[PDB]
Amino acid sequence: EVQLVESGGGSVQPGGSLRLSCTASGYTFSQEFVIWFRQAPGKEREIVSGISLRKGWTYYADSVKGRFTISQDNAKNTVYLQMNNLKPEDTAMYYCAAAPTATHALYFDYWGQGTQVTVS
Numbered sequence: 001e002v003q004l005v006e007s008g009g010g011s012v013q014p015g016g017s018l019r020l021s022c023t024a025s026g027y028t029f030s031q032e033f034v035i036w037f038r039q040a041p042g043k044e045r046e047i048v049s050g051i052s053l054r055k056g057w058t059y060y061a062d063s064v065k066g067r068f069t070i071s072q073d074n075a076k077n078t079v080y081l082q083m084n085n086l087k088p089e090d091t092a093m094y095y096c097a098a099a100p101t102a103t104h105a106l107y108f109d110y111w112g113q114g115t116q117v118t119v120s
């Protein structure tokens with residue numbers, strides 16, 4: 001009984017900006033870590049960012065550091081991904097996922113239908 005729903009994608013010019021949302025519902029208290037991952041057609045899933053909701057620790061893929069920022073709003077039970085200075089290489093479907101621990105990518109779960117980001 002946890003569900004995550006992604007929104008906020010769109011088409012933007014190179015250098016532009018989007019804010020994605022990951023809106024959670026259900027008994028989400030166990031799901032202390034949240035990630036955003038992306039998948040482009042014919043490529044493998046890439047984790048772009050993660051956050052510990054309890055401690056505020058963050059992770060970023062090297063190629064998004066300085067461009068993307070993950071944050072949370074607990075009243076809205078939402079995690080956001082600010083994407084600034086977007087690049088063609090960022091084009092993909094974006095999903096969010098959550099887990100009780102931060103040891104294995106495989107344990108992250110509960111992604112929704114994703115949201116498309118296109119940079120051109």
